[PDB]
């Protein structure tokens, strides 16, 4: 494998966590909403089946 540099592409590089953050809340935020509902359901579900009311 061979690699070289670019300059226009490297003007302000993001770390991977910043590249994810760029799109995670705006372009693909439906996934984030869906995941929150799964986390919500997991929280309420695991509590309801294990503890005395």
Binding site for other proteins (CB under 8 A): 1-51, 53
Q: Is 17 helix (H, G, I), strand (E, B) or coil?
A: helix
Q: How far is the CB of 36 from other proteins (least distance, A)?
A: 4
Q: How far is the CB of 44 from other proteins (least distance, A)?
A: 6
Distance CA 5, CA 15 (A): 17
Q: How far is the CB of 40 from other proteins (least distance, A)?
A: 5
């Amino acid at each position: 494998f061979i690699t070289s540099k670019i300059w226009d592409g490297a003007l302000a590089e993001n770390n991977h966590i910043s590249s994810i953050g760029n799109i995670m809340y705006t372009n693909y935020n439906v996934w984030l909403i869906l995941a929150s509902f799964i986390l919500l359901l997991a929280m309420v579900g695991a509590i309801v089946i294990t503890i005395k009311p």
